[PDB]
Design a protein around this ligand. Structure first.
Ligand code: 5C3
Length: 78
């Protein structure tokens, strides 16, 4: 689980609500993005782990499915 809106989550879960695999935050493939550890160095944007850099309502990630840009992660609110 994550606390509040999930901004402080730093666990190692990396799978979405539909069972897709999170793209790595430093990767531009399949989805080109601007939410990189480059730009957000203090948000825990390590590997492909579920995170919340933009103050969303839960941890999320861009997905490895080329047709689905981003999803919330299959974690529950503590
Ligand atoms: N938690 C919700 C999602 C909303 C889409 C968002 C995105 O795609 N942002 S971005 O790569 O900086 C970006 C922003 C504007 C134009 C191109 C790319 C990722 C986070």
């Amino acid at each position: 689980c994550y606390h509040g809106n999930g901004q402080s989550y730093r666990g190692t879960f990396s799978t979405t609500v539909t069972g897709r695999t999170c793209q790595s935050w430093s990767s531009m493939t399949p989805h080109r993005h601007q939410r990189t550890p480059e730009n957000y160095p203090n948000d825990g944007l390590t590997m492909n782990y579920c995170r919340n850099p933009d103050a969303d309502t839960g941890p999320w990630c861009f997905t490895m499915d080329p047709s689905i840009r981003w999803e919330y992660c299959a974690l529950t609110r503590c």
